[PDB]
Amino acid sequence: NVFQTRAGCLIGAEHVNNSYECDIPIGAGICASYQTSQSIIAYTMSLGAENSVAYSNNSIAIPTNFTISVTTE
Amino acid sequence: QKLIANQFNSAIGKIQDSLSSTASALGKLQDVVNQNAQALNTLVKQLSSNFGAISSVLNDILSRLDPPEAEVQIDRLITGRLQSLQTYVTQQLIRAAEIRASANLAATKMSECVLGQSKRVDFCGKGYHLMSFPQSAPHGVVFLHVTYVPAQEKNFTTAPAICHDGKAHFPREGVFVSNGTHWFVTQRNFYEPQIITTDNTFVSGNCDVVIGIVNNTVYDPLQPELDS
Amino acid sequence: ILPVSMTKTSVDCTMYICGDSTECSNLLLQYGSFCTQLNRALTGIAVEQDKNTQEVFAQVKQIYKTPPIKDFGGFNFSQILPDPSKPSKRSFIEDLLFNKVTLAQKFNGLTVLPPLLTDEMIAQYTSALLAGTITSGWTFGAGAALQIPFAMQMAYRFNGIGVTQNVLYENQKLIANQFNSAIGKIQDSLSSTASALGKLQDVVNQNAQALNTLVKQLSSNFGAISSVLNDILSRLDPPEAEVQIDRLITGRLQSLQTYVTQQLIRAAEIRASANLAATKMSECVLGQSKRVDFCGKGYHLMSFPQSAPHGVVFLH
Ligand SMILES: *[C@@H]1O[C@H](CO)[C@@H](O[C@@H]2O[C@H](CO)[C@@H](O)[C@H](O)[C@H]2NC(C)=O)[C@H](O)[C@H]1NC(C)=O
Numbered sequence A: 001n002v003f004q005t006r007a008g009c010l011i012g013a014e015h016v017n018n019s020y021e022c023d024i025p026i027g028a029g030i031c032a033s034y035q036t037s038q039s040i041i042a043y044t045m046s047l048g049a050e051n052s053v054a055y056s057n058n059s060i061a062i063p064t065n066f067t068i069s070v071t072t073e
Numbered sequence B: 001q002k003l004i005a006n007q008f009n010s011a012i013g014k015i016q017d018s019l020s021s022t023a024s025a026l027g028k029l030q031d032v033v034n035q036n037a038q039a040l041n042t043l044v045k046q047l048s049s050n051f052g053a054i055s056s057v058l059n060d061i062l063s064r065l066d067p068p069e070a071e072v073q074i075d076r077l078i079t080g081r082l083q084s085l086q087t088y089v090t091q092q093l094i095r096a097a098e099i100r101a102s103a104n105l106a107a108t109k110m111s112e113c114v115l116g117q118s119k120r121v122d123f124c125g126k127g128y129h130l131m132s133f134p135q136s137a138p139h140g141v142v143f144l145h146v147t148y149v150p151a152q153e154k155n156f157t158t159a160p161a162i163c164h165d166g167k168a169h170f171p172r173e174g175v176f177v178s179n180g181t182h183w184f185v186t187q188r189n190f191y192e193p194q195i196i197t198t199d200n201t202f203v204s205g206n207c208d209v210v211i212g213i214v215n216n217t218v219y220d221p222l223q224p225e226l227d228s
Numbered sequence C: 001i002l003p004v005s006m007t008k009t010s011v012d013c014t015m016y017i018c019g020d021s022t023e024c025s026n027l028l029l030q031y032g033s034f035c036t037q038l039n040r041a042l043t044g045i046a047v048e049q050d051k052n053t054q055e056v057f058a059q060v061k062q063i064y065k066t067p068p069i070k071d072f073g074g075f076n077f078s079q080i081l082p083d084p085s086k087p088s089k090r091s092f093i094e095d096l097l098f099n100k101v102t103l104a105q106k107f108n109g110l111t112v113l114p115p116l117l118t119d120e121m122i123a124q125y126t127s128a129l130l131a132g133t134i135t136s137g138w139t140f141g142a143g144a145a146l147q148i149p150f151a152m153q154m155a156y157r158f159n160g161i162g163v164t165q166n167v168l169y170e171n172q173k174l175i176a177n178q179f180n181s182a183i184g185k186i187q188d189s190l191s192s193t194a195s196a197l198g199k200l201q202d203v204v205n206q207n208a209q210a211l212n213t214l215v216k217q218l219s220s221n222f223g224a225i226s227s228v229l230n231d232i233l234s235r236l237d238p239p240e241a242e243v244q245i246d247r248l249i250t251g252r253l254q255s256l257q258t259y260v261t262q263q264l265i266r267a268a269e270i271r272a273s274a275n276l277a278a279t280k281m282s283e284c285v286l287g288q289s290k291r292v293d294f295c296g297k298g299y300h301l302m303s304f305p306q307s308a309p310h311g312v313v314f315l316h
C-alpha cells in the first residue's frame, strides 16, 4: 500500500478519513498510529474537541464546587 | 475542612501510585545522563582511528618506523585527536550553558512557588496556586504543586447594576445573579447567594446612563431596628 | 513581535564532502564517527524546533469558537477574528503579516523538512485562544470556560487595576470607540510601514546567508590542484591523488563543523526567545499581569495573540 504526503510518501500504512490525537509524528500535519484489524494507519491529526460556550449578554456561569489537585513538575 | 483534607490525601496517594507504576515520567533527568554518557563514549572511541596514518597506536609506529616519517605520522594523529577534543569541549560548554539556564528557572520556581504564593498564571501549575512542596532527585528537583480548580458550574442572569430610588447600586465585591425570580449578590468564584443590602453595594449617581440596568428592591439593615 | 522557531534544516555528511566518489568515501571512513555527530546535532535541533511551537501555541484543551451573534457591548473584533471567506481561516491582520514577509534550492546533500504543524493549525490555535479570551475571560485558563458578558469582564479588569467599575460602566461608549480607533490605527500602521518585522526577517536572512556560505565553500582549492574530485581522480596517479584529496576532505569537514556550531548557538538563542514567548502567552493572554512593563507600557488590561511566519504577534 502506497500513500503520498507532503513530507515524502509513506508505504505500508493505509489512509483514514477520521482524525485522532497525534501518536507518531510524521510531518505536515500527518500523524501515524497503530490501530487496535491490527494495521498501521496514517491520518490527519485533530487539535482537540470542538466546543462553543453559550455566550450571551446577560448570562453567567458561577461554580458551586471545587477540587484540589496535585501536579508534579 | 474535612472534604479538602480528604481530597489532598487522595491526591498524594494518587501521585505516589503514578510514580510507583509508570517509569517514563523522568525523561528530563535521564536525557542529560544519556547525552553525557554518549559524549564520553564517542570521545573515548575516537582514539582508535587512523586519521590517515599507518596505524592507530603510536607505540606500534615508533617500534617499526624510523623517526623522520614516524614524526609525521605522530603529528597527523596529534592533529586529529586535538581537534576531536576541541569538538567535545565545545559541545560540553553549550550543554552546560543550557543546564545553567534550566537551573536558574528552577531556583526562581523554588523561591516563588515554595517560599510564597504566586499570582503568575500557569507558573506553578494549572489552576489557582495554593502551595508547593520540593522533593530532591538525582541531578534535579521535583515540585508537587497544589492547585485549586472549580468543578461544577451553573447558569444565571447577571446585571451591571440595580436601581432602587433612581440611584445606581454596584457590587462592592462580587456579582449580581438571579435564580429566576429573586436577585442576589455572590462572590465570583463560589456560589454563595446573599440578600442585596447597603453593605454590599455602593451608590454612584443616577441610573439612566448604565446599559443593561434592571431595578429591584435593596434592603436596609437600619429601618427594622429603628422601628422598635 | 518576537520569533518562535527557525527553519527545519538537515544536511547529509557523506554526500556533501564526497558526492559520488567511492575513493573519497573510502578515505573518509578512516576519520572515525565524524559523519554521525552532525546528523545527531541537527536531529536534536529539528526536534527542539518542533517542540518550541508545540509548547508556545498548544495551550488549550479544547477548540472554542465565538457565537454567531457579535454582541460584545459595542466593541468590534472583526479585524482579528477569523474570516471564513478566505480560503485559509486567517484573520485580516494575520493576512497582512503573512504578505509582509518575503522569502531547498541547493541540492548538494542538504534538505529542509516541513514543520509538524501547518499554518492552518496555528491559525486554529490562535482563533481558539482568542475566542476563549473574548467569551470566558481568564476562567478558561484554570478550568472549564465560563461565559460572562464582555462589559462585566472589562469591569473586572478595571477593578483589577485599582479603578472602580462605575468608571467603566458610565463611560462604556468612550472606551468602545477608543478601542476601535486603536485597532484601525494599528492595522493602518502595519499596512503602511514595512520595517516593523525586522525581528522575524533577520532570522531568515541569517539562515539563508549561512546556507549560502556553506554551499559556496565547495569551490575552495584548500591547497590542492583543483576543487573537483573527478578532475583530480581522472588526471593524477592514485598514490598522490589520495594525498591531494585529503586536503579537500579536511577543509570540507571543518567547514561543516563550523556551520553546525553556528546553528547550535542560533538554535539556543531561538529557544530562549520561544520560552519568553510562551511565558508571555501564558501570563498576558490567559490572565491579567501586575508586572510593570511586561505586557506593554502602562497598566495592563488584556492581550490578543496573532500568528506570523515563524513567530507570534501580541496586541497588548
Ligand atoms: C462537591 O464535590 C465533592 C467531590 O468532588 C462532593 O463530595 C462527595 O459527595 C458524595 C455524596 O454524593 C460522596 O459520596 C463522596 O464520597 C464525596 N467525595 C469526597 C471526596 O468526599 C461534594 O458532595 C460536592 N458538593 C456538593 C454540595 O454536592
Ligand SMILES: *[C@@H]1O[C@H](CO)[C@@H](O[C@@H]2O[C@H](CO)[C@@H](O)[C@H](O)[C@H]2NC(C)=O)[C@H](O)[C@H]1NC(C)=O
Pocket (backbone or CB within 6 Å): B179, B180, B181, B182
Ligand atoms: C429562588 O430563590 C428564592 C430564595 O431562596 C426562592 O424563594 C424561596 O423558595 C422556597 C422554596 O424553594 C420557599 O420555601 C421560600 O418561602 C421562598 N422564599 C420566600 C421569601 O418566599 C425561590 O423559590 C427560588 N426560585 C426558584 C425558581 O428556585
Ligand SMILES: *[C@@H]1O[C@H](CO)[C@@H](O[C@@H]2O[C@H](CO)[C@@H](O)[C@H](O)[C@H]2NC(C)=O)[C@H](O)[C@H]1NC(C)=O
Pocket (backbone or CB within 6 Å): B163, B213, B214, B215
Ligand atoms: C425601573 O422602574 C421604573 C419605575 O419607577 C421604570 O420606569 C418606567 O419606564 C416605563 C417605560 O420605560 C415608563 O413608561 C414609565 O413612565 C417609567 N416610570 C417612571 C416612574 O419613570 C423602569 O422601566 C424600570 N427599569 C427598567 C430597566 O425597566
Ligand SMILES: *[C@@H]1O[C@H](CO)[C@@H](O[C@@H]2O[C@H](CO)[C@@H](O)[C@H](O)[C@H]2NC(C)=O)[C@H](O)[C@H]1NC(C)=O
Pocket (backbone or CB within 6 Å): C076, C077, C078, C079
Ligand atoms: C467593525 O469594523 C469593521 C471595519 O473593518 C466594519 O466593517 C465595515 O463596515 C462599514 C459599515 O459601517 C462598511 O462600509 C465597510 O465596507 C466595512 N468594511 C469591511 C472591510 O467589511 C464593521 O461593520 C464593524 N462592525 C460592526 C458591527 O459594524
Ligand SMILES: *[C@@H]1O[C@H](CO)[C@@H](O)[C@H](O)[C@H]1NC(C)=O
Pocket (backbone or CB within 6 Å): A015, A016, A017
Ligand atoms: C475516504 O477516504 C478515501 C480514501 O481512503 C477517499 O477516496 C474518500 O474520498 C474519503 N471520503 C470522503 C468523504 O472524502
Ligand SMILES: *[C@@H]1O[C@H](CO)[C@@H](O)[C@H](O)[C@H]1NC(C)=O
Pocket (backbone or CB within 6 Å): A054, A061, B153, B154, B155
Ligand atoms: C447554560 O445554558 C446553556 C444553554 O441555555 C447550556 O448550553 C449550558 O450547558 C448551560 N450551563 C450549564 C452549566 O449547564
Ligand SMILES: *[C@@H]1O[C@H](CO)[C@@H](O)[C@H](O)[C@H]1NC(C)=O
Pocket (backbone or CB within 6 Å): A057, A058, B211, B212, B213, C071
Ligand atoms: C441582549 O441581546 C438581546 C438580543 O439577543 C437584546 O434584545 C437585548 O436588548 C440585549 N441586552 C442589552 C442589555 O443590551
